[PDB]
């Protein structure tokens, strides 16, 4: 019915891809603690004192990945529900 | 002066060429040759 399956299949695969990739990128940030090779982006113009501020900020950055994963998973569930409308 | 000469020269050349091209195109103009024009006598 609403949000026909023809595009809902594509939506489901897209949501699965989003969940998986965002979760893995967040885990790579946290576990490796944002090695500059795998993590260039950040927001700090002053770090000359020590690395602890850098690590804290990179943890803060990596936190958002799991919120993105949750949103993608909810999207996938919504699309799966729309598929069941037959 | 050796800079102002080049500056004024190139601006003048560009403007003159533009007016020449536009008036030239506006002269050789196709009115359409409709029943008013092609018809005679």
């Amino acid at each position: 019915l609403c949000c026909g399956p023809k595009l809902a299949a594509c939506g489901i695969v897209l949501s699965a891809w989003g969940v998986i990739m965002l979760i893995m990128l967040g885990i790579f940030f946290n576990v490796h603690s944002a090695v500059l090779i795998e993590d260039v982006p950040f927001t700090e113009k002053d770090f000359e004192n020590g690395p602890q501020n850098i690590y804290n900020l990179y943890e803060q950055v990596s936190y958002n990945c799991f919120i993105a994963a949750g949103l993608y998973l909810l999207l996938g569930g919504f699309s799966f529900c729309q598929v069941r409308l037959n | 002066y050796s800079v102002v000469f080049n500056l004024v020269l190139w601006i003048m050349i560009g403007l003159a060429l533009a007016v020449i091209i536009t008036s030239y195109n506006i002269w050789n103009m196709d009115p359409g040759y409709d029943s008013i024009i092609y018809r005679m006598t």
């Binding site: 965002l22 927001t43 803060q60 950055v61 958002n64 993105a68 994963a69 | -």
Partner: protein, 397 residues
Amino acid sequence: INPAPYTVITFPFLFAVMFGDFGHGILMTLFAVWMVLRESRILSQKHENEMFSMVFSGRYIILLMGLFSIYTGLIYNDCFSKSLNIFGSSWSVRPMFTQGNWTEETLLGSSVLQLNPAIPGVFGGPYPFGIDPIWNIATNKLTFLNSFKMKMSVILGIIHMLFGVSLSLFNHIYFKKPLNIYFGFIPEIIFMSSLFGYLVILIFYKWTAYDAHSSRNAPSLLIHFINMFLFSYPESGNAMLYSGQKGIQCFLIVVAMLCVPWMLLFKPLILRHQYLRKKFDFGDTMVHQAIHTIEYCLGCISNTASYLRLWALSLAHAQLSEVLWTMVIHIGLHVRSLAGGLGLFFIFAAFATLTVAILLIMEGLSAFLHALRLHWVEFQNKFYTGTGFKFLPFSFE
């Protein structure tokens, strides 16, 4: 000589060299799994999409292509344009660098680049598997990547061609044609070897010979090849790569020269002698032989030069993937305490659509057709006549 048994594998390999990325390969293999597992229902189903029909024709093509793409993504240490530091780096050790008069420079580091040298005592060392991850973040990565990729492409292309001609030798020996083996295969294989196997071996010698401390006046192979062609030996300006190069190089020139006349005069004359023994337009045969010999001799250089498509497309693919990483998802990471995931969800949706649209199906198609062409001309024409009939059975609809 049926070319499917070898093509079935060497085609996705060359594709993967042209398309060496991890994530894209995973996507392709997933599509392959989907299409293979659901074959029965789709086959017994009517579809309006003819593009999908010709896509579905190449099932195991796409499957093997994705598998080798995953592999070559692992070997470059390329994974969505970023390396995966798995089991260690060996290049940058700043605490050891402080020994070599390296301290306080980083105060000016805010506006300089401060090159890292090779071998202050513990540096260098080979990564056991693929490219060292540090190269992925180095600003001068392009130089080393260009060198390595150009050399790999040229080496791959020369072995492909010798494969071609060695395979041709089978084609002629079965058909009981002693003339073709004796005055055919032999001069061409000797010419190919003497002209480019030397380049391959020289590349490997330079790789396994010169250390870091010899960075001054490191010999250049390309200029030596220009002097190989032009026979010019300046007294200075380029040191010999290895001792005694003069005699071997001169003999290589002389055998390369001596290759060409063997394929022109001898075999038309032997054909004329056989025809005289029988008791045949001689001039037409001379024209055909000249056409064949000139074609082969010029196609030598043309094909070895055209094999640079591998390096060209590999570098273009790497640059494109890095470009996508640089200005699509880079903006998605920021300081906003709450709006990070929300915006990143939209941004990654767009990233997925754009990388599906361009690099997934399209650059794959370009690499696919380029490898097909490399198979049709540079490989096939050396053993494949390409003539005859095709079966027309009596079966009805």
